[PDB]
Motif scaffolding. Structure first.
Motif, short mmCIF file in Angstrom:
data_model
loop_
_atom_site.label_atom_id
_atom_site.label_comp_id
_atom_site.label_asym_id
_atom_site.label_seq_id
_atom_site.Cartn_x
_atom_site.Cartn_y
_atom_site.Cartn_z
N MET A 184 0.83 -1.20 0.00
CA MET A 184 0.00 0.00 0.00
C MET A 184 0.86 1.25 0.00
N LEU A 185 1.94 1.25 0.78
CA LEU A 185 2.84 2.39 0.86
C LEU A 185 3.87 2.42 -0.26
N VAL A 186 4.02 1.32 -0.99
CA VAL A 186 4.98 1.23 -2.09
C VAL A 186 6.38 1.50 -1.54
N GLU A 187 6.67 0.97 -0.36
CA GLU A 187 8.00 1.09 0.22
C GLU A 187 8.19 -0.04 1.22
N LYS A 188 9.43 -0.20 1.67
CA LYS A 188 9.81 -1.27 2.58
C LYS A 188 9.81 -0.76 4.02
N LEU A 189 9.28 -1.57 4.92
CA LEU A 189 9.19 -1.23 6.33
C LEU A 189 9.97 -2.25 7.16
N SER A 190 10.33 -1.84 8.37
CA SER A 190 10.91 -2.74 9.35
C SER A 190 9.80 -3.30 10.24
N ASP A 191 10.15 -4.32 11.01
CA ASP A 191 9.18 -4.90 11.94
C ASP A 191 8.77 -3.88 13.00
N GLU A 192 9.71 -3.03 13.42
CA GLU A 192 9.38 -1.99 14.39
C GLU A 192 8.45 -0.95 13.78
N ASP A 193 8.59 -0.68 12.48
CA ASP A 193 7.69 0.27 11.84
C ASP A 193 6.27 -0.27 11.77
N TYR A 194 6.12 -1.57 11.51
CA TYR A 194 4.79 -2.17 11.50
C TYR A 194 4.18 -2.17 12.89
N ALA A 195 4.96 -2.55 13.90
CA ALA A 195 4.42 -2.63 15.26
C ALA A 195 3.91 -1.28 15.73
N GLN A 196 4.62 -0.20 15.41
CA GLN A 196 4.18 1.13 15.83
C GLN A 196 2.92 1.56 15.09
N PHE A 197 2.81 1.21 13.80
CA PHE A 197 1.63 1.61 13.04
C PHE A 197 0.37 0.98 13.62
N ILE A 198 0.46 -0.28 14.04
CA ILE A 198 -0.71 -0.97 14.56
C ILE A 198 -1.13 -0.36 15.90
N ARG A 199 -0.16 -0.07 16.77
CA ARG A 199 -0.50 0.52 18.06
C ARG A 199 -1.23 1.84 17.88
N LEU A 200 -0.80 2.64 16.91
CA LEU A 200 -1.46 3.92 16.67
C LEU A 200 -2.87 3.70 16.13
N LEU A 201 -3.05 2.70 15.27
CA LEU A 201 -4.38 2.43 14.73
C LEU A 201 -5.31 1.90 15.82
N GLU A 202 -4.79 1.10 16.74
CA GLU A 202 -5.61 0.61 17.84
C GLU A 202 -6.09 1.76 18.71
N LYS A 203 -5.20 2.70 19.02
CA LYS A 203 -5.59 3.85 19.83
C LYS A 203 -6.71 4.63 19.16
N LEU A 204 -6.71 4.69 17.82
CA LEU A 204 -7.78 5.38 17.12
C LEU A 204 -9.12 4.68 17.35
N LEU A 205 -9.13 3.35 17.32
CA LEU A 205 -10.36 2.61 17.55
C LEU A 205 -10.87 2.81 18.97
N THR A 206 -9.96 2.85 19.95
CA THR A 206 -10.37 3.05 21.33
C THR A 206 -11.19 4.33 21.49
N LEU A 207 -10.82 5.38 20.76
CA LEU A 207 -11.46 6.68 20.93
C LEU A 207 -12.78 6.73 20.18
N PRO A 208 -13.65 7.68 20.52
CA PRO A 208 -14.89 7.85 19.74
C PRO A 208 -14.56 8.07 18.27
N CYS A 209 -15.25 7.32 17.40
CA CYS A 209 -14.93 7.30 15.98
C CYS A 209 -16.18 7.65 15.18
#
Ligand code: K
Ligand code: K
Ligand code: MG
Ligand code: MG
Ligand code: MG
Ligand code: MG
Ligand code: MG
Ligand code: MG
Ligand code: MG
Ligand code: MG
Ligand code: MG
Ligand code: MG
Ligand code: MG
Ligand code: MG
Ligand code: MG
Ligand code: MG
Ligand code: MG
Ligand code: MG
Lengths: 132, 140, 49, 325, 567, 231, 197, 101
Positions: free
Chosen positions: D137-162
């Motif tokens: 989707m990003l058309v670029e290469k990520l590290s495992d740490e980059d993926y882990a941080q992206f998911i944590r940020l997306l989870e925080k979004l779901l926690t909040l009123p959406c």
RNA sequence: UUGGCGGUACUUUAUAUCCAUCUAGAGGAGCCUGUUCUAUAAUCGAUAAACCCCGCUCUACCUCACCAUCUCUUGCUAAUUCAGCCUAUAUACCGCCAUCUUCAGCAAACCCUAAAAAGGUAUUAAAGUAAGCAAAAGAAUCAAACAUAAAAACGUUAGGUCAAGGUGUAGCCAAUGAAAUGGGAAGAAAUGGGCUACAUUUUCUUAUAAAAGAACAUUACUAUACCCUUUAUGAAACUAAAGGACUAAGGAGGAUUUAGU
């Protein structure tokens, strides 16, 4: 370590063709067979005689076209006909190839008592699959 | 050719004899090859050719055979270390039916002359003929 | 018939229609060895009399 | 001292010519196969190439291919700066402009939800996209740490009123899990000349194969290969294995089975029949019962088969004695 | 089912771009190299036969075994002589025959005739061969003929034929007189040689000569000998000398051929055509119409080799069509060539390229350009690789049809056939393109073609130490660059007129000036004046005055322009 | 036997013995030779002439046939090729000029040329590179034991006030030269010259344990300094 | 004397409505200069595409069917129809064939690649006839079944005579017919020692 | 030239066994039975013994045709394990691949 | 400074594995086979892990390279003051492998350091970067997975193999070459691996491995030894199988050690 038919790594400056790059365990998976006859099929005879003819036919073509072979030749037997398909560099003049084709065909047809034809595809230079 | 076309192409001479023709009840053609794809292409060519000449054909795949043998990997000693090799044979059986002898010769020539390299054929003709004239009548 | 192959290819090499890299390699090792004085002695004239 | 072929990056004119040659290729391939060029499709092309160039190589990446240049040639990432040299994207110098451009948006969304201020399971049976999918989707290469941080940020979004905008956003990064139907495939119910109902199913244990034909109505008469089951199976444990399917569903003495088992030994043949009878009996039991069978082991094929022997070894796992030293 | 591939070279030639014959010279050279390699293998096989003797082919293939031509029978017997005769050795057989006579051992008359056949046919000379001839009064053939104790009809006949073959016409006729005196009877083959002798001999009076040849025919009926095709073909081939007086005799022969039952072959008409349509024919005003009747007679028929002049027929028929400028007849002749397997009698290497060259040239002249391009694609290269004049004819046809858009394409085709550096062809391409004005798109396409033809001149100049740029190409290439958005290149080409010392033409000079006015560049306008001064052209002064009015000249330009005006 | 004959590539690989335990053990030496270098296809010891292969197929409009050279003619051709072999061999023998630095066997003070071009075709033809030290340092490793690297110190300058130095390290000397040479172009000081021929004033300094005492001198005095300082 | 330059591939001159059967009339190897298709073959390298047709040994190693195309096969079989003869319509079933032609002669041909066309298995012949088709008295059928031994199959009532002893197939074929005639005539003959069964 | 002097001796053994095949068949048949007098059988036991030793077909050894290796040969190809692996591992044997299962 | 090592602590470790747990073995008897030893006129090589039913998926003659005796001298080939060499060196090599190892690295181009012999990581991130090889993925065991195979870089052990073949250097050329015939022996020996037995969950017989009838401690269990007959292969039985009797030891094996998820 396995040393069979494996062109080993250097420092990225060794050109290798598609045939050379793949080790024996890729035969029938990524690369096919250079010779195609019916003598190794089940319940078929004369494997030894077809195999001996192949060894000679390869040594003959190397000497008859010295330095003009871009890759290993492909041998195709159909009925009693033999067909030799060789990738050849464009080093020699055109008329010389016509001489060597007429000579090598007639000589190998009177040596094995079969119709033998030579098929030559000329390349400007060796084709490099990868640099290893 | 756009403008230059043969006018009356010469065709071979086929002369009908007075001898009766052979009658093949069945004609089984077992092709063998190391490659399955070659058999698939040959099966399509052979089935299409039969259908175009009016012959009745059926096709099945006899079970494949794999022959394996072991060799010694090293040139000297190191017995426990081996290398194994195999040869695979694949089959496609073309069972033809109710063919005269003229139809079976032209068909077999056409398909045998177009047999790919590495492919072996095993035709098994089954002729049907009357009883011997002596056997027809018991004679003491 | 190993004699037919070895003889036929040798005859072709002398006619210039076949090239034997192995033989050309050996022909130069003999040429160099003779210069060094290690060449084959003549029969009947060996080191031992 | 680097002397190897460089990446042959494909310009737009190059790919453009590769698409004109492909378009002329289709018209020729259609003319060869006698088909109409207008309707000739990618599926027909793949079939034609397989006929005209039969290859039996096991790996299909190594087989002949006449595919559209888009499928074969990897999408060339476009130049990121113009003629003056000014990068097109404000995060160009980060080195991961697309990963950080996405993490910039999701962090700004979170702030507005937190500043501005129900059940969060709007979507179920879904998973977060794997790192490989995100990279595409990003058309670029990520590290495992980059993926882990992206998911944590997306989870925080779901926690909040959406609001519905956020739900659509997080949807892009949720992939519908294709949970497989781990349920039995019920067999049809045929009818005999007498008119009795019966179902058939195959079973395989080790090298043995069986074909049972359970009947809806019976007195418990099981015949194996035209013989009785007490005669064919003189061992009790083999008969118990045939009893397991019916005893479990309390259906003993209510069906008449006809079996045909070929191959294997006594124990492998009883097991093959057990599976064949369990699969045939499915058509005559309730769906709750079918799940009861599947969860008791009656409907699973046993994958345990004899292992090949190894060269240089006494057996599959047995080794030669390590000689004394 | 299959037909000729129009985009492929003849099957003999290897199917590789590097190995495809570009020109007609390479075509023959490539085949001679192939034939040369075949002969090198056959030499090795026949010189080291012990290595080519193991036979592994079932059924056995006789033609793939070593040949042996030297006699292996050592004893001197009539049988040993028979072997040498069978092997066709002439000198060895004579030695063993004389040795047999020296011993005096009996030799069969039939065997003695087999020796004369070999000697008479080869005329006492060993058979021609390759490896690392008039009749001689004192020769083995005549000597052996005299030593023969018993003579038969065949013996005399063999001498008559061998003499005629080896140009011994006078003696052969004398031998025939002896055969009549012995009361023997000749065969058809001997009568054909005698007729071939009377014709070759120059007789003062044709009427006597014709009456003599007829006398041989009358003795062919007295001896109950029936004529064959060759007999009539031989008489007609002799008649081609007397074109004027052989017309009525020639027709009578063909009528007699049908009544007897001998079927006229392609060779028999080849002689009638030569006799009725002379190549060196001054009287072209009213040619004969027989060719139309012959083609009607032969329409749809299939022919087989039955004479040695069958190949000649097709090449001659097209020539007469080109002379008569009848394209309908040329289609009938070509249509006959396509029926059945008549294609095999088109001719050999000399006559195959004449027939198609004559045919295609006639098409371009008398056929619509649309059809002419269909024939062009079919015949070339598959049938024949044409010489450059064929392309000049094609380019001229395109010009006459007002379809010069294809001239660039014809140039690309010509380069494959080894006309890249042909001066005559390059001058025609540029000339037609630059002869008249064209729309902007066409001019741009022509400019690209002009650039390609320029590269040929440029590369040729660099390779060769001494090179001359012909004047007309320079003008044509320069004009095309101006007309096709390549004016910058044309200004550089203006200097090449001085480098090669070629006199610029008045039209070209003014054209450069017209472009300069639109550009508004006085500097460029003065550049034209510089070259005019170099060659002292009178118009140069007028052109300089024209620049004065066309552009505002700066004071520096006035001084520079004034200097050039003075020069 | 014809079936026990191997190719030239395989014959030289074994005979040269480059690969093997000898290489790691520091083991003139045999030189590879190409045996097809002067051989013409179609030329044999017997001297046969094959039209279309080793002789013209057509000569003066005559289609040639097979032939063989006489014993005298072939002996000339054989001797001629022997001469051509000597000419090619002599080429390798020739040894040509180089310039020594401070000493004949040392690299110190040897010009190795300008640094390589830059990213946008930035040529440095006006800069010259000089070697100041070549050292063979060693790092002990478990895999290789003693492993050797070449540490090269070079200086660059355009002779017009701009100069720099760098150190390049590699396993091969040629690589260490490239690394130092292109690295030093990134560390270009500009040195102030009084009237373009001398320093502006006396300079005394201690760098670590090295002491330097430079003095300003008049024209024609020349460079009277450590050989490295002269460089 | 500059090196020779190769011409452009002739595929460029090939129209998309050409007569392809003429281009590949017979079995030939893959010629990248004659096949107007952008085919690629070869396991691709990372960030690489499969190799192109020119100089491709893998495409050359394939036994292509370019000469055999659906358009060619139909044009070929159209010509080959004149050779064929029509099966008799009356024999529309296998049972009908057994009625009028009870004897089944099995002969096998073998096609292989090599210089020799000889196969040892081609001599064998097999005759299969049903005893019901033969006119046999109750005595004869019992005598025929005892003599033939395992050649007779009670389930199918078929007598199988396999003859490979003679060198040629025409000899083995005539021998199997002979074996049937003697067995048939001997079965009808009654010997005095038979009364002691 | 054959590979070595051992292959040369083997080749001659194979050509002398072909010459003496019918003879050794006819004589040996007289011994492999119980129907002929033992006096004839005792005498045939010596006629077969008197034939040259290389006529005996059990003195033939199958050697690799290309290296003349006495053991390690595969009879279908007449090659040693070492020579066979070199051709097989290079794709030069038609249909021979490595066995993975 | 780097590596190596430490009878230096610390944390984490092996997954049929270091200990422990589990099952059948080995170590005792009888034989089969390898090796050493002794020894013979009589090969060679492997011989700690990584040799020891290894090269041999195989030695009565042959094979064969060994020993003894007799014989041949342009002595396989188109040509060659040449043919031939299982003659020395695996410490000159190719070829083909073993071991670490199913270990995770290797090498190339760069970049950084108050100089660099070398080193270069912190994710709430602090100087590292982007390509190749290996791993991974993929393919094979003909649905699926798992599993098993295969694969496994650079190096380490001058590891193994001049005797698969080839080959550098040195050596023999009436002999270190070629050929024929006959032999290549054995053990009051040690040791490795295997096979069989020691029995009652056993022995024999019919059966089909279910059931039944007998046997069951001096030869009951128990000889693939020795010996005696017959057959198969071969020219040759010295080999192998099948019977026959003869039957000895062995009574579940000391420390110790092997394999299996
Ligand atoms: K090695
Ligand atoms: K010796
Ligand atoms: Mg086990
Ligand atoms: Mg010095
Ligand atoms: Mg040798
Ligand atoms: Mg043997
Ligand atoms: Mg353990
Ligand atoms: Mg021995
Ligand atoms: Mg011996
Ligand atoms: Mg020796
Ligand atoms: Mg070593
Ligand atoms: Mg391992
Ligand atoms: Mg898989
Ligand atoms: Mg892997
Ligand atoms: Mg060592
Ligand atoms: Mg050793
Ligand atoms: Mg039981
Ligand atoms: Mg016996």
């Amino acid at each position: 370590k396995n040393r069979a038919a494996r062109v080993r790594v250097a420092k990225g400056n060794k050109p290798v063709s598609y045939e050379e790059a793949h080790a024996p365990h890729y035969i029938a998976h990524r690369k096919g067979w250079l010779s195609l006859h019916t003598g190794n099929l089940d319940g078929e005879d004369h494997a030894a005689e077809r195999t001996l003819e192949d060894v000679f036919l390869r040594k003959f073509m190397m000497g008859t076209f010295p330095g003009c072979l871009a890759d290993q030749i492909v041998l195709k037997r159909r009925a009693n006909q033999v067909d030799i398909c060789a990738l050849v560099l464009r080093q020699l003049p055109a008329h010389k190839f016509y001489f060597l084709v007429g000579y090598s065909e007639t000589l190998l047809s009177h040596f094995y008592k079969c119709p033998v034809r030579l098929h030559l595809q000329t390349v400007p230079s060796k084709v490099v699959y990868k640099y290893i | 050719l756009h403008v230059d076309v043969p006018k009356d192409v010469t065709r071979p001479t086929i002369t009908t004899s007075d001898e009766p023709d052979t009658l093949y009840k069945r004609l089984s053609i077992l092709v063998k090859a190391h490659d399955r794809a070659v058999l698939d292409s040959y099966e399509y060519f052979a089935v299409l050719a039969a259908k175009e000449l009016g012959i009745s054909i059926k096709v099945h795949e006899p079970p494949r055979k794999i022959e394996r043998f072991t060799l010694l990997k090293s040139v000297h000693i190191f017995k426990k270390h081996r290398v194994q090799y195999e040869m695979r044979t694949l089959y496609r059986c073309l069972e033809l039916k109710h063919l005269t002898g003229s139809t079976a010769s032209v068909y077999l020539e056409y398909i045998q002359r177009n047999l790919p390299e590495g492919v072996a054929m095993e035709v098994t003709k089954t002729q049907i003929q009357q009883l011997p004239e002596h056997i027809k009548e018991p004679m003491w | 018939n190993h004699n037919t192959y070895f003889a036929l290819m040798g005859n072709l090499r002398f006619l210039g229609l076949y090239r034997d890299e192995h033989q050309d390699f050996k022909d130069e090792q003999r040429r160099l060895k003779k210069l060094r004085g290690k060449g084959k002695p003549r029969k009947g004239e060996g080191k031992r009399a | 001292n680097v002397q190897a072929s460089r990446q042959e990056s494909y310009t737009e004119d190059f790919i453009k010519k590769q698409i004109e040659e492909f378009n002329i290729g289709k018209r020729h391939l259609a003319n060869m196969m006698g088909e109409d060029p207008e309707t000739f499709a990618e599926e027909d092309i793949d079939r034609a190439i397989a006929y005209l160039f039969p290859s039996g190589l096991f790996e299909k990446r190594a087989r002949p291919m006449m595919k559209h240049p888009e499928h074969i040639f990897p999408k060339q990432r476009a130049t990121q700066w113009g003629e003056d040299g000014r990068p097109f994207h404000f995060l160009f110098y980060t080195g991961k402009q697309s990963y950080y451009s996405l993490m910039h948006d999701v962090y700004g969304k979170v702030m507005q939800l937190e500043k501005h201020r129900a059940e969060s399971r709007d979507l179920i049976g879904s998973r977060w996209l794997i790192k490989e999918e995100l990279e595409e989707m990003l058309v670029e290469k990520l590290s495992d740490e980059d993926y882990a941080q992206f998911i944590r940020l997306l989870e925080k979004l779901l926690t909040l009123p959406c609001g519905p905008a956020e739900e659509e956003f997080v949807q892009r990064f949720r992939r519908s899990v294709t949970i497989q139907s781990k349920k039995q495939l019920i067999e049809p119910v045929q009818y005999d000349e007498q008119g009795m109902a019966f179902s058939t199913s195959e079973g395989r244990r080790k090298s043995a194969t069986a074909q049972a034909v359970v009947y809806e109505h019976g007195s418990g008469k099981i015949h194996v290969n035209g013989v009785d089951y007490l005669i064919y199976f003189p061992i009790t444990q083999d008969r118990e294995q045939l009893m397991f399917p019916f005893h479990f569903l309390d259906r003993l003495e209510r069906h008449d089975v006809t079996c045909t088992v070929s191959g294997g030994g006594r124990s492998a043949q009883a097991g093959a029949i057990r599976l064949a009878m369990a699969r045939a009996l499915c058509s005559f039991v309730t769906e709750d019962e079918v799940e009861w069978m599947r969860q008791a082991g009656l409907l699973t094929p046993d994958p345990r088969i004899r292992e090949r022997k190894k060269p240089g070894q006494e057996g599959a796992r047995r080794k030669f004695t390590w000689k004394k030293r | 089912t299959v037909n000729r591939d129009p985009t492929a070279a003849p099957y003999v030639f290897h199917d590789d771009p590097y190995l495809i014959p570009t020109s007609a010279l390479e075509s023959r050279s490539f085949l001679l190299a192939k034939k040369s390699g075949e002969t090198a293998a056959k030499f090795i096989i026949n010189s080291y036969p012990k290595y080519f003797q193991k036979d592994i082919a079932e059924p056995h293939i006789p033609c793939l075994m070593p040949e042996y031509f030297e006699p292996q029978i050592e004893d001197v017997s009539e049988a040993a002589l028979e072997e040498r005769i069978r092997l066709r050795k002439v000198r060895a057989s004579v030695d063993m025959f004389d040795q047999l006579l020296q011993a005096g051992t009996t030799v069969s008359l039939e065997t003695t005739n087999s020796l004369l056949d070999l000697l008479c046919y080869y005329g006492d000379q060993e058979p021609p061969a390759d490896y690392p001839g008039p009749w001689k009064a004192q020769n083995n053939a005549e000597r052996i003929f005299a030593l023969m104790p018993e003579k038969n009809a065949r013996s005399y006949c063999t001498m008559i034929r061998g003499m005629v073959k080896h140009r011994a016409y006078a003696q052969a006729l004398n031998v025939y007189t002896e055969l009549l005196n012995n009361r023997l009877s000749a065969d058809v083959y001997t009568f054909n040689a005698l007729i071939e002798a009377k014709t070759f001999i120059l007789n003062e009076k044709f009427e006597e000569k014709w009456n003599d040849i007829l006398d041989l025919l009358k003795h062919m009926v007295a001896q109950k000998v029936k004529p064959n095709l060759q007999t009539f073909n031989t008489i007609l081939k002799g008649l081609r000398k007397c074109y004027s007086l052989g017309r009525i005799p020639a027709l009578q022969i063909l009528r007699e051929m049908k009544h007897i039952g001998i079927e006229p072959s392609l060779a028999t008409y080849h002689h009638i055509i030569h006799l009725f349509y002379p190549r060196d024919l001054s009287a072209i005003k009213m040619p004969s119409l027989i060719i139309y009747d012959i083609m009607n007679e032969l329409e749809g028929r299939t022919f087989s080799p039955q004479d040695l002049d069958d190949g000649r027929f097709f090449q001659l028929a097209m020539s007469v069509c080109s002379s008569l400028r009848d394209l309908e007849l040329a289609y009938q002749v070509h249509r006959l060539l396509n029926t059945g397997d008549n294609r095999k009698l088109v001719g050999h290497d000399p006559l195959r390229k004449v027939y198609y060259s004559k045919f295609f040239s006639l098409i371009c002249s008398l056929e619509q350009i649309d059809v002419t391009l269909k024939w062009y694609k079919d015949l070339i290269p598959s049938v024949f690789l044409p010489h450059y004049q064929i392309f000049i004819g094609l380019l001229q046809a395109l010009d006459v049809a007002n379809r010069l858009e294809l001239v660039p394409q014809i140039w690309k085709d010509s380069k494959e056939y080894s006309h890249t550096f042909r001066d005559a062809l390059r001058e025609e391409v540029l000339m037609l393109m630059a002869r008249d004005k064209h729309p902007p798109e066409l001019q741009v396409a022509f400019a690209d073609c002009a650039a390609d033809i320029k590269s040929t001149y440029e590369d040729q100049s660099a390779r060769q130490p001494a090179f001359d740029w012909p004047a007309n190409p320079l003008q044509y290439i320069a004009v095309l660059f101006l007309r096709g958005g390549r004016s910058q290149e044309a200004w550089k080409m203006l200097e090449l007129f001085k480098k090669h010392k070629k006199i610029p033409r008045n039209e070209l000079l003014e054209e450069f000036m017209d472009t300069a006015k639109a550009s508004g560049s006085t500097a460029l306008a003065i550049e034209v004046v510089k070259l005019a001064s170099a060659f002292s052209l009178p118009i140069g002064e007028s052109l300089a005055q024209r620049v004065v009015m066309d552009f505002t000249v700066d004071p520096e330009q006035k001084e520079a322009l004034g200097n050039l005006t003075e020069l | 036997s014809f079936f026990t004959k191997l190719t030239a590539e395989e014959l030289w690989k074994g005979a040269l013995a480059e690969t093997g335990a000898g290489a790691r053990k520091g083991r003139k030496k045999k030189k590879r030779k190409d045996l097809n270098r002067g051989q013409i296809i179609g030329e044999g010891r017997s001297g046969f002439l094959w039209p279309g292969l080793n002789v013209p197929l057509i000569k003066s409009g005559v289609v040639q046939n097979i032939g063989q050279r006489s014993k005298e003619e072939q002996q000339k051709v054989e001797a001629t090729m022997v001469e051509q072999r000597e000419e090619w061999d002599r080429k390798r023998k020739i040894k040509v000029k180089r310039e020594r630095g401070w000493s004949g066997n040392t690299w110190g003070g040897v010009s190795i040329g300008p640094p390589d071009p830059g990213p946008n075709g930035e040529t440095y033809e006006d800069f010259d590179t000089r070697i100041l030290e070549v050292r063979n340092v060693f790092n002990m490793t478990a895999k290789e034991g003693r492993k050797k690297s070449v540490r090269v110190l070079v200086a660059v300058g355009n002779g017009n006030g701009a100069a720099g130095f760098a150190i390049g390290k590699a396993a091969d000397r040629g690589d260490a030269f490239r690394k130092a040479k292109n690295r030093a172009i990134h560390y270009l000081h500009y040195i102030e010259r009084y009237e373009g021929h001398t320093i502006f004033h006396d300079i005394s300094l201690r760098f670590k344990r090295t002491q330097i005492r430079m003095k300003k001198q008049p024209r024609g005095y020349g460079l009277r300094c450590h050989r490295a300082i002269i460089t | 004397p500059m090196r020779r330059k190769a011409l452009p591939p002739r595929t460029e001159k090939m129209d998309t409505d050409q007569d392809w059967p003429s281009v590949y009339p017979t079995a030939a190897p893959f010629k990248p200069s004659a096949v107007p298709l952008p085919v690629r073959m070869g396991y691709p390298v990372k960030k690489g595409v499969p190799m192109a047709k020119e100089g491709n040994l893998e495409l050359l190693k394939i036994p292509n069917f370019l000469h055999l195309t659906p358009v060619a096969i139909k044009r070929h079989c159209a010509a080959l129809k004149d050779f064929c003869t029509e099966w008799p319509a009356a024999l529309d079933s296998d049972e009908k064939c057994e009625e009028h032609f009870p004897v089944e002669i099995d002969t096998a041909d073998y096609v292989s690649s090599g210089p020799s066309i000889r196969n040892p298995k081609a001599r064998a012949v097999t005759l299969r006839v049903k005893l019901s088709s033969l006119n046999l008295d109750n005595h004869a059928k019992k005598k025929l079944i005892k003599l033939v031994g395992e050649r007779y199959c009670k389930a199918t009532d078929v007598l199988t005579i396999t003859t490979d002893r003679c060198p040629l197939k025409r000899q083995n074929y005539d021998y199997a017919v002979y074996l049937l005639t003697v067995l048939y005539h001997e079965s009808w003959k009654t010997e005095d020692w038979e009364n002691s069964k | 030239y054959y590979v070595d002097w051992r292959m040369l001796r083997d080749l001659k053994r194979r050509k002398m066994a072909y010459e003496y095949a019918d003879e050794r068949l006819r004589i040996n048949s007289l011994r492999k039975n119980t129907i002929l007098p033992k006096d004839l059988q005792e005498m045939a036991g010596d006629e077969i013994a008197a034939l040259p030793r290389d006529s005996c077909p059990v003195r033939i050894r199958n050697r690799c045709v290309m290296t003349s290796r006495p053991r390690g040969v595969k009879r279908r190809w007449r090659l040693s394990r070492i020579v066979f692996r070199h051709l097989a591992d290079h794709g030069l044997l038609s249909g021979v691949q490595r066995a993975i299962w």
